[PDB]
Design an enzyme around this catalytic site. Structure first.
Site, PDB file in Angstrom:
ATOM      1  N   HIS B  42      40.632 -19.136  18.120  1.00 23.18           N
ATOM      2  CA  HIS B  42      40.538 -18.803  19.541  1.00 23.18           C
ATOM      3  C   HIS B  42      40.728 -17.343  19.865  1.00 23.18           C
ATOM      4  O   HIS B  42      40.421 -16.912  20.977  1.00 23.18           O
ATOM      5  CB  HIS B  42      41.491 -19.661  20.373  1.00 23.18           C
ATOM      6  CG  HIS B  42      42.910 -19.173  20.372  1.00 23.18           C
ATOM      7  ND1 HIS B  42      43.866 -19.716  19.587  1.00 23.18           N
ATOM      8  CD2 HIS B  42      43.526 -18.150  21.087  1.00 23.18           C
ATOM      9  CE1 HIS B  42      45.031 -19.087  19.805  1.00 23.18           C
ATOM     10  NE2 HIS B  42      44.822 -18.120  20.710  1.00 23.18           N
ATOM     11  N   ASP B  88      41.913 -24.765  14.924  1.00 22.39           N
ATOM     12  CA  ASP B  88      42.167 -23.406  15.406  1.00 22.39           C
ATOM     13  C   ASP B  88      42.601 -22.470  14.259  1.00 22.39           C
ATOM     14  O   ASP B  88      43.793 -22.157  14.078  1.00 22.39           O
ATOM     15  CB  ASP B  88      43.210 -23.427  16.526  1.00 22.39           C
ATOM     16  CG  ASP B  88      43.287 -22.114  17.284  1.00 22.39           C
ATOM     17  OD1 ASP B  88      42.364 -21.289  17.138  1.00 22.39           O
ATOM     18  OD2 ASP B  88      44.268 -21.895  18.023  1.00 22.39           O
ATOM     19  N   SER B 185      49.773 -15.245  19.599  1.00 19.40           N
ATOM     20  CA  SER B 185      48.863 -16.240  19.048  1.00 19.40           C
ATOM     21  C   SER B 185      48.038 -15.632  17.910  1.00 19.40           C
ATOM     22  O   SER B 185      47.717 -14.439  17.941  1.00 19.40           O
ATOM     23  CB  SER B 185      48.004 -16.912  20.138  1.00 19.40           C
ATOM     24  OG  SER B 185      46.937 -16.086  20.526  1.00 19.40           O
ATOM     25  N   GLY B 186      47.759 -16.450  16.897  1.00 18.75           N
ATOM     26  CA  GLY B 186      47.079 -16.015  15.682  1.00 18.75           C
ATOM     27  C   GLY B 186      48.041 -15.479  14.625  1.00 18.75           C
ATOM     28  O   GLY B 186      47.661 -15.341  13.459  1.00 18.75           O
TER      29      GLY B 186
END
Ligand code: 4O5
Ligand code: CA
Ligand code: MG
Lengths: 52, 234
Positions: B42, B88, B185-186
């Site tokens: 994402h 994801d 995130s990530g």
């Protein structure tokens, strides 16, 4: 608690149970020591180690 | 990161930051090897062109260890969709190899069965990033780390307003004011075992940051080990 469920089978890293016995292995960049348990880094900056 | 502590010299060497055309971070990453970065699928929708920065702990001073790398190949999971946030995960191949040094080293990729039985059954994992310090605040100029407890899967599913797939797991706190947040995130979720840190998750999503009765949702890296291995060969 037996084999791998017993203190990770005395292995530094990966533990597997083959034919009712423990078999240890290591992440890429490490070699299994002569004792068949400890993992020795093959060179500098091995994975998963904080840097000094 | 909401709460937690500063990553001290050399403690979070696998942290990567995805930076946009204006040299500002928008997502984390984990260093897997000299050529590969692990991130969330994402994150590939949050900027048209991006690079990767490694070896940085303070975005407001030149510490001497920083290195920016261009991306050669983006490898997104072909089953990812924004609708569900399932699958994801993405790997990035860099144009130039990362030179390891102080504050720049890879996290270890574990074996699936061993990681699920032994790492994911530990009390806690560690999340890190340059993200927000509060849900309603600015991004951190300092790399932070946070110990997050593994959360019982049933409890997580009951607390969630969205479907928790087989490709996700939960970590964090019920009410305690600590969590990953916007901009993290990530990034890495790692689990320590005999002083060695193994990749166990990717910061994926949350219903806010550090909310009561809510946890952080992470991509279950162990479900993707064969996929990561394949992606890192091509
Ligand atoms: C399956 N669920 C979803 O599709 C979903 C649900 C909520 C969010 N969502 C809503 C607000 C959050 N944005 S955030 O940047 O603050 C993410 C923060 C995190 C906290 C702990 C994490 Cl682990 S990631 C968000 O992700 C989402 F992106 C996907
Ligand atoms: Ca800096
Ligand atoms: Mg909570």
């Amino acid at each position: 608690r037996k084999l791998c469920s017993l203190d990770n089978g005395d292995c530094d890293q990966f533990c597997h149970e083959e034919q009712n016995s423990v078999v240890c292995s290591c992440a890429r960049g490490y070699t299994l020591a002569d004792n068949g348990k400890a993992c020795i880094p093959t060179g500098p900056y091995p994975c998963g180690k904080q840097t000094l | 990161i909401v709460g937690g502590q500063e990553c001290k010299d050399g403690e979070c060497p696998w942290q990567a930051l995805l930076i946009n055309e204006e040299n500002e971070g928008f997502c984390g990453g984990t260093i897997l090897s000299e050529f590969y970065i692990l991130t969330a699928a994402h994150c590939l929708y949050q900027a048209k062109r991006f690079k990767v920065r490694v070896g940085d702990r303070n975005t407001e001073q030149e510490e001497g260890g920083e290195a920016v790398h261009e991306v050669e190949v983006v490898i997104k999971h072909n089953r990812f969709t924004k609708e569900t946030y399932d699958f994801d995960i993405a790997v990035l191949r860099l144009k130039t190899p990362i030179t390891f040094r102080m504050n720049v080293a890879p996290a270890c990729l574990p074996e699936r069965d061993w990681a699920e039985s032994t790492l994911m059954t530990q009390k806690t994992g560690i999340v890190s990033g340059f993200g927000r310090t509060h849900e309603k605040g600015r991004q951190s100029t300092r790399l932070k780390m946070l110990e997050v407890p593994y959360v019982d899967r049933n409890s997580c599913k009951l607390s969630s307003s969205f479907i928790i797939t087989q490709n996700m797991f939960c970590a964090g706190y019920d009410t305690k004011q600590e969590d990953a947040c916007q901009g993290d995130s990530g990034g890495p979720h790692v689990t320590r075992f005999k002083d060695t840190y193994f990749v166990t998750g990717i910061v994926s999503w949350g219903e806010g940051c550090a909310r009561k009765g809510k946890y952080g949702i992470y991509t279950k890296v162990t479900a993707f080990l064969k996929w990561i291995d394949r992606s890192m060969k091509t």
